[PDB]
């Protein structure tokens, strides 16, 4: 398969990430005022990465060659697990912590002491830990970040088998790379997909958290971020 | 047609063993749990003003029942038993619902879009009646269509469930290692059979599609846990499921 | 806490 | 959905 250019995907990943990557630590999360308030800080991040996720979408093969409404749909049913896979991968660079796109690190301790240790732990164990142990590259990332994008089962899809057709072309392009660049291990391609159920559940658990801080917490939520969460 | 070493062979012999002994046949025993008459009489739904209760009480009873066999089944798993208790619990809690729909898809009639559990026939308006929200209903039948279309041989069914069971990401597991390896074991053994497709009337990325559905079962297990609460008094009837979904 | 579930696992 | 429609266009 050449219809889904692996080169154009690894290139789309490269475009997203900031050219200037500096990292500062975050305060324990005892106070919502400080520049560093764990939860608050994640929300500022996800809002920013919301915009760039859009452009990451575009740069993906055939995504712009879809209806206006098939694009919005796929984002509504993916931005969650898509942004999660982003920082999940980025944070393989460090142990017991999370690298945020604002240029801020977040330690496992700031998590627990902010209430969100349960899920923070789950991301490192099911995502950050796994991608690392398996040495999953940036190309492979974009191929999963893409497969999630093109989710056939998204409800309200004007053309279901259309989105299911692209998610077949990424399956090909990717298995190629996994049997090409990584021929030593057979089931490498399969190992890369095995993390999808875990990310689905994690994505769901993360929505929950987001809904609580909105409808209860004093967590200052922003525009674009806001728009992406609308489902009881 | 790939190999299936001495171990993958034994693995599949115990899967279908304790499986035939508790599931895959239980769908016919659904009638034995007080099934409203119109489930026998397919040529007409439930009269608009008939009480809903009789149907619901039937749902509950068969719902609690399947789970009772998703358990009876796992108790005939040397390995599952091998695990500790705080873990045995958490695994069921994370995949009992998921698994019911797994085995239940085998009674799905793609043509009529209905479940046929012996002399009974369930429809999506029945769900509507029980109280399940239209949207959860759409999503639920959509999943089953998807799943049924793949025409997965029996062993391709018994294995898919195994993966749903043995999941380390489940909240509550303590042997996350001993479980992640078992998962890995299951995941591979299935990868074997799929390739050996004697007859090829299906896809090539069948497995890759399944994993998307295991994630649908994740999206679904969570959506259902909420539904039996939005439905007044339904939760109260199947306390077993209340625990599974606690 | 998980009364009936515990109940069911104990044995055959 | 105001915000998203704009990005997907321009
Ligand atoms: C990991 C702790 C979870 C609690 C808060 C909810 C998180 C889910 C929202 C997606 C996270 C956005 C990531 C931003 C980035 O990596 O740049």
| Separation CA B160–CA B171 (nearest Å) | 20
**CATH number, position A193:** 1.10.565.10
- Check if the beta carbon of residue B202 is closer than 8 Å to that of residue B150: yes
Nearest to B123 by CA among B111, B107, B112: B112
For ligand 1, atom 2: residue with the closest CA: A120
How does DSSP assign A24-78, residue by residue?
B----SS-SSSS--HHHHHHHHHHHHHHHHHHHHHTSTTTTTS-HHHHHHHHHTT
User: What is the Cα–Cα distance from D2 to A72, expressed in whole angstroms?
Assistant: 11
The number of distinct structural domains making up chain A is 1
Measured CA to CA, the distance from residue A117 to residue B232 in angstroms comes to 33
Q: A135 burial class (0-12, 13-18, 19+ CB within 10 angstroms)?
A: exposed
Q: How many CB atoms lie within 10 A of CB A18?
A: 11
Tell me B3's DSSP state: -
Q: Which domain holds residue A146?
A: 1-232
Taking chain B, what is the end-to-end CA distance rounded to the nearest angstrom?
43
**Which neighbouring-strand residues pair with A90?**
none
Provide the residue range defining the domain that includes B31.
1-246
Q: Does residue B67 contact residue B99 with C-beta atoms inside 8 Å?
A: no
Distance CA B22, CA B26 (A): 7
Q: What are the beta bridge partners of residue A100?
A: A104
* Alpha carbon distance A166, A106 (integer Å): 36
How far CA B119 is from CA of A96, B31, B36, B38, B107, in Å, comes to 56, 8, 12, 11, 11
Which residues on chain A are in Cβ contact (under 8 Å) with B171?
Answer: 118, 122
Distance separating alpha carbons of residues C8 and B85, to the nearest angstrom: 11
- Structure tokens belonging to residue A145: 């970040």
CA distance B67 to B71: 6
Q: Is the distance from CB of B64 to CB of B242 less than 8 angstroms?
A: no
Pairwise CA distance, residues A75 & B20, whole Å? 42
Q: Is A125 on the interface with B (CB under 8 A)?
A: yes
* Cβ of A229 less than 6 Å from ligand 1: no
Which strands make up the sheet holding B108-109, listed edge to edge? B108-109, B114-116, B121-122
In degrees and rounded to multiples of 5, residue B151 shows phi and psi of: 40, 75
> Which residues neighbour A76 within 8 Å (Cβ) at sequence distance 6 or greater?
A154, A228, D1
Closest CA to B72 of B102, B54, B92: B92
* Contact state of D5 with A72 under an 8 Å Cβ cutoff: yes
**Contact D4/A75, CB-based, under 8 Å?**
yes
Beta carbons within 8 Å of A131's beta carbon, 6+ residues apart: A88, A89, A92, A141, A195
Q: Considering only CA atoms, which of A198, A180, A204, A68 is closest in space to residue A130?
A: A198
Q: Quickly list DSSP for chain A.
A: --SS-HHHHHHHHHHHS-S----B----SS-SSSS--HHHHHHHHHHHHHHHHHHHHHTSTTTTTS-HHHHHHHHHTTHHHHHHHHHHHHGGGSSSEEEETTTEEEEHHHHHTTT-HHHHHHHIIIIIHHHHHTT--HHHHHHHHHHHHS-TT-TT-S-HHHHHHHHHHHHHHHHHHHHHT--SSTTHHHHHHTTHHHHHHHHHHHHHHHHHHHTTS-----HHHHHT----
Which runs of E-coded beta strand occur in B17-117?
108-109, 114-116
Contact A179, A46 (CB under 8 A): no
Q: Give how far Cα A172 sits from Cα of A8, A14, A168, B178, B201, Å.
A: 15, 21, 6, 32, 19
What is the rounded CA–CA span in Å between residue C3 and residue D6? 53
| Token pair 């919301």 in the structure block, residue | A50
C-alpha to C-alpha distance for A59 and A83, rounded to whole angstroms = 16
CA B28/CA B34 separation, integer angstroms: 13
Nearest ligand 1 atom to alpha carbon A210 = 6
Query: Quick one: closest CA in A to B192, which residue?
Result: A187
Residue A12 to residues A48, A142, A199, B206, Cα–Cα distance (Å): 17, 8, 21, 28
Rounded to whole angstroms, the Cα distance separating A41 from B158 reads 44
> To the nearest whole angstrom, how far is the Cα of B75 from the nearest Cα of chain A?
25
Helix B134-149 vs helix B206-230: crossing angle, to nearest 10: 160
| Residue of A175, A187, A204 lying closest to B222 (CB–CB) | A204
Q: Is B114 helix (H, G, I), strand (E, B) or coil?
A: strand
Mutate to test the interface with B, among C6, C8, C12 (most CBs of B within 10 A): C8
Cβ neighbours of residue A85 closer than 8 Å, sequence gap 6 or more? A127, A141, A144, A145, A148, A199
- Pocket lining: A49 vs ligand 1, CB cutoff 6 Å: yes
What residues contact residue A95 under an 8 Å CB cut-off, 6+ apart? none
Q: Residue B76 is part of a domain; what is its CATH number?
A: 1.10.565.10
- Rounded Cα gap, residues B22 and B75, in angstroms: 10
Report how far apart, in Å, the C-alpha atoms of A10 and of each of A101, A138, A142, A177 are: 18, 6, 6, 12
C-alpha–C-alpha distance, residues B161 and B140, integer Å: 17
The Cα-based distances of A128 to A88, A92, A93 in angstroms read: 5, 6, 9
Q: Say yes or no: CB of residue A100 within 6 Å of ligand 1.
A: yes
- A90 labeled part of a ligand binding site: yes
Cα-flanking dihedrals φ and ψ of residue B62, to 5°?
Answer: -85, -25
Query: Domain total for chain B?
Result: 1
Check: CB of residue B5 under 8 Å from CB of residue B87: no
Resolution in A: 2.6
Residue B33 has phi, psi (to 5 degrees) of: -125, 40
Q: Is D8 at the interface with chain A, CB within 8 A? A: yes
Residue B239 tokens read as 């306390």
């Amino acid at each position: 398969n050449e219809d889904m250019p692996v080169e154009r995907i690894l290139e789309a990943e490269l475009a997203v990430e900031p050219k200037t990557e500096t990292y500062v630590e975050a305060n324990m999360g005892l106070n919502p005022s400080s520049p560093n308030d764990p939860v608050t800080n994640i929300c500022q991040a996800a809002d920013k990465q919301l915009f760039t996720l859009v452009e990451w979408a575009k740069r993906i093969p055939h995504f712009s060659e879809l209806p206006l409404d098939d694009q919005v749909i796929l984002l509504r049913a993916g931005w969650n697990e898509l942004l999660i896979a982003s920082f999940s991968h980025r944070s393989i660079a460090v142990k017991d912590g999370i690298l945020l796109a604002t240029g801020l690190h977040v330690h496992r301790n700031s998590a627990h002491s902010a209430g969100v240790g349960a899920i923070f732990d789950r991301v490192l164990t099911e995502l950050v830990s796994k991608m690392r142990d398996m040495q999953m590259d940036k190309t492979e990332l974009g191929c999963l970040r893409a497969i999630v994008l093109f989710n056939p089962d998204s409800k309200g899809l004007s053309n279901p088998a259309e989105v299911e057709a692209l998610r077949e072309k990424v399956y090909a392009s990717l298995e190629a790379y996994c049997k090409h660049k990584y021929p030593e291990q057979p089931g490498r391609f399969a190992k890369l997909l095995l993390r999808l159920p875990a990310l689905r559940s994690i994505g769901l658990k993360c929505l929950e958290h987001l809904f609580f801080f909105k409808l209860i917490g004093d967590t200052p939520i922003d525009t674009f971020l806001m728009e992406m969460l609308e489902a009881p | 047609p790939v190999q299936l070493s001495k171990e993958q062979e034994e693995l599949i012999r115990t899967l279908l063993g304790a499986h035939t002994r508790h599931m895959g046949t239980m769908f016919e025993q659904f009638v034995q749990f007080r099934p409203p008459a119109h489930l026998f009489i397919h040529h007409q739904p439930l009269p608009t003003l008939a009480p809903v209760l009789p149907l619901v009480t039937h749902f509950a009873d068969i719902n609690t029942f399947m789970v009772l066999q998703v358990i009876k089944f796992t108790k005939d798993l040397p390995v599952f038993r091998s695990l500790p208790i705080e873990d045995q619990i958490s695994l069921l809690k994370g995949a009992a619902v998921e698994i019911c729909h797994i085995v239940l898809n085998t009674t799905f009639c793609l043509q009529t879009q209905n479940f046929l559990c012996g002399p009974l026939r369930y429809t999506i308006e029945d769900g509507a009646r029980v109280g399940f929200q239209v949207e959860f209903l759409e999503l639920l039948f959509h999943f089953h269509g998807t799943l049924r279309k793949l025409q997965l041989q029996e062993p391709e069914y018994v294995l898919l469930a195994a993966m749903a069971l043995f999941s380390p990401d489940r909240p509550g597991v303590t042997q996350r290692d001993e479980i992640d390896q078992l998962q890995e074991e299951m995941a591979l053994t299935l990868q074997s059979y799929i390739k050996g497709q004697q007859r090829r009337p299906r896809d090539r990325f069948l497995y890759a599609k399944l994993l998307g559905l295991l994630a649908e079962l994740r999206s679904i297990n969570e959506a259902y846990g909420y539904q039996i609460q939005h439905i007044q008094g339904l939760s109260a009837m199947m306390p077993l499921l209340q625990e599974i979904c606690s | 806490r998980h009364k009936i579930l515990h109940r069911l696992l104990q044995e055959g």
